[PDB]
């Protein structure tokens, strides 16, 4: 029963039909349309263009069109080095890849005059690099300039996450210049183009690959906040091993991990009634909305416990251990914040994820914290 | 303090602004503009004659002078002087001062290569040797035959990088040399604060007015105002999930039910119940996670009831209602 679901985990898209119109001159060897391909994240958009060019290169005339990933540069030189790697040649590399005018000499081909288009992968690392109008916008500016006179032009295909980048362009560039205009976006496929690809990615079909309306149910009730349904099939591939482990069932398993302690399991964290007392003690110190030290909390803990004698006053060292019991369940977090007297000195400020509405319910059942409120 | 504000203005998008701006700057006062340009054309032989005396020529005046300098330097002067000395004509090295990315090292590395490398000047390249290397250039040039070999142009000399003081003194030592003619323009009203009697001794500036009331097309690009957030988050909503449009629509209604300030906002509990009422929000976490996406792109605010409020104006939210949400 394994080998049917061993193969489970692994032209084709209805977005490739768009881009061949957008590359309408790429089979007639002319300069194509003006390509700035954006997208909200997770939407397949990195592999989307990679699907096109791999279908382009396997289809396509002299054949040399290269694509490089802009991740580890922070600087516009070695991209123009990596276009030279499809030549397998040798030259003086440093000057030719550095200046704007130095790129222009690089664009005279050798063997058969096939035009070249570059593909700039993950442009947002250089967009969201160092300060905008100094280097990175200038880097954006310099690449999109295609004023070259022969039709051999370095057509850009760049990609980005957040859609602020168009308004970042200068008003000269927004005057119908370069690869600007066609701001081709990709709205996140709800279930209406992505699930059908999963259907065709179920070409080798096992018998029980589950009631597919539940798969449709999975698609409809994941599409609130999602972009990657194969990865959201990779959460089906984990639950398909649950039915192997036991020889949207799992989204139900995963949300109760996150929703609880405020409604119900707050009292699970405080089986000690003193842990209930010390939890209200933190919030009474939160009146002075300050750097809530473990000492200022201990200050209000003593000066209240001398008034109402519910228990004896305990140690600060005990007060250290008891607040860590509050910590490991995930209620209150402790951080070493800032005080700048001698050096960067670290006093510990706490923060609570509970509200007084979710407090007042669980304390009226216990009239021993009622003196303390 | 009832003040009319730029937020309370009929705003204009990107393509609408720049096109009708391009209509005015190429059709408003066209006839008198070239009519000025023909009048000042007769001054061009006068500039040629004085510039043989090594005079740093400086152009002030209202309006952009960028087009005028490039006509005067490139087409008129630079072949006229090459013909009058007796072959490629005189090299023109412009300096775009409105471009803030001008440094002192890079432009001078061009200069010593533009000027003659007759000696091993890379030996004196050592750590600031720039004033050192130009001093060895100056005293050699005192005993050379007097002829211009280079004319440089510095547009917008009060620019964001050229007005820095270690760059200004660098240009000061260039101007005392007789072989190079220095034709620059500034635009500031406090431009003669830049020079003392030390530098102007090295400069021997003269002045001329040019006022053509040009729009400064290139010089407007790097500059920005609030035209260039209410407009920022106007584009993110155009690419999201369809549910975020609806949960912002229910957000924007009761936040405009009551400028858009804090007081018109809503509590988190009831808004969870309201977005539970239309079968949208499952609980607090599923609400907040796709509300952090409105938080991450700074599209909504929260202050303290637990009030979440939109920081856009009263007029803006109904514009966000009828256009992008609907």
């Amino acid at each position: 029963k394994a080998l049917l679901q061993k193969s489970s985990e692994l032209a084709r898209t209805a977005e490739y039909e768009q881009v061949m119109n957008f590359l309408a001159k790429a089979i007639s060897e002319h300069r194509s349309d003006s390509l700035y391909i954006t997208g909200p994240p997770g939407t397949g958009k990195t592999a989307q263009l990679d699907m096109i060019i791999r279908q382009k290169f396997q289809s396509l005339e002299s054949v040399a069109v290269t694509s490089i990933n802009c991740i580890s540069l922070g600087e516009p030189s070695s991209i123009f080095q990596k276009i030279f790697d499809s030549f397998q040649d040798l030259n003086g590399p440093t000057l030719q890849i550095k200046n704007m005018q130095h790129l222009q000499k690089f664009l005279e081909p050798y063997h058969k005059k096939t035009t070249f288009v570059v593909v700039l992968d993950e442009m947002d690392r250089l967009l969201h690099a160092n300060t905008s109008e100094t280097q990175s916008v200038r880097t954006i500016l310099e690449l999109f300039l295609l004023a070259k006179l022969p039709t051999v032009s370095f057509v850009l295909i760049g990609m980005a996450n957040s859609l602020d980048m168009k308004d970042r362009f200068l008003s000269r560039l927004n005057l119908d210049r370069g690869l600007l205009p066609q701001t081709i976006v990709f709205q996140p496929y709800t279930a209406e183009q992505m699930y059908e690809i999963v259907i065709q990615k179920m070409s080798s079909l096992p018998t029980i690959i589950f009631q597919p309306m539940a798969i449709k149910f999975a698609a409809k009730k994941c599409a609130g906040n999602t972009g990657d349904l194969r990865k959201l099939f990779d959460v089906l591939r984990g639950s398909i091993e649950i039915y192997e482990l036991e020889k949207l069932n799992y989204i139900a398993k995963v949300f109760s991990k996150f929703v609880n302690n405020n409604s119900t399991r707050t009292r699970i964290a405080k089986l000690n009634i003193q842990q209930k007392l010390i939890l209200c003690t933190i919030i009474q110190s939160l009146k002075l909305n300050s750097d809530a030290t473990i000492d200022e909390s201990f200050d209000h803990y003593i000066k209240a416990i001398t008034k109402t004698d519910t228990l004896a006053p305990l140690q600060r060292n005990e007060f250290l251990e008891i607040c860590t019991i509050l910590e490991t369940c995930g209620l209150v977090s402790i951080k070493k914040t800032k005080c700048k007297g001698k050096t960067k000195r670290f006093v510990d400020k706490i923060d609570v994820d509970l509200d007084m509405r979710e407090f007042y319910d669980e304390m009226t059942k216990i009239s021993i914290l009622k003196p303390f409120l | 303090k009832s003040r009319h504000t730029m937020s309370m203005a009929p705003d204009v998008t990107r393509e609408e602004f720049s096109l009708v701006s391009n209509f005015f700057n190429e059709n408003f006062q066209k006839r008198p503009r070239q009519k000025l340009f023909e009048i000042q054309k007769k001054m061009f032989p006068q500039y040629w004659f004085e510039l043989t005396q090594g005079f740093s020529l400086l152009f002030y005046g209202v309006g952009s002078k960028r087009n005028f300098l490039e006509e005067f330097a490139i087409d008129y002067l630079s072949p006229k002087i090459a013909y009058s000395q007796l072959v490629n004509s005189i090299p023109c090295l412009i300096l775009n001062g409105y471009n803030p990315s001008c440094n002192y090292r890079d432009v001078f590395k061009e200069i010593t290569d533009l000027l003659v490398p007759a000696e091993l000047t890379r030996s004196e390249t050592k750590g600031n040797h720039v004033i050192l290397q130009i001093q060895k250039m100056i005293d050699f040039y005192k005993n050379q035959p007097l002829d211009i070999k280079l004319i440089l142009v510095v547009h917008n000399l009060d620019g964001p990088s050229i007005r820095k003081n270690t760059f200004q003194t660098m240009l000061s030592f260039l101007s005392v040399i007789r072989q190079i003619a220095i034709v620059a323009s500034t635009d500031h009203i406090y431009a003669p604060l830049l020079w003392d009697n030390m530098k102007a001794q090295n400069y021997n500036f003269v002045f001329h007015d040019i006022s053509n009331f040009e729009p400064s097309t290139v010089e407007s690009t790097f500059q920005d105002v609030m035209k260039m957030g209410a407009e920022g988050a106007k584009y993110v909503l155009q690419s999201l999930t369809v549910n975020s449009k609806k949960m912002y629509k229910l957000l924007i209604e009761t936040q405009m039910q009551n400028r858009g300030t804090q007081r018109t906002g809503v509590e988190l509990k009831l808004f969870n119940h309201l977005c539970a009422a239309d079968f949208i929000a499952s609980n607090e976490i599923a609400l907040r996670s796709m509300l952090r996406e409105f938080i991450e792109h700074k599209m909504a605010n929260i202050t303290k009831m637990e009030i979440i409020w939109v920081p856009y104006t009263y007029a803006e939210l109904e514009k966000l209602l009828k256009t992008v949400l609907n």
């Binding site: 005018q101 500016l141 310099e142 | 087409d75 090299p91 775009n96």
Partner: peptide
Amino acid sequence: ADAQRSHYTVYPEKRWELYHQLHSHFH
């Protein structure tokens, strides 16, 4: 077109002679 790139170089009298005998002599 190129004006946003900084510092791009490019490679494109009976009366006055009586001045010329006077000017340099003064200098």
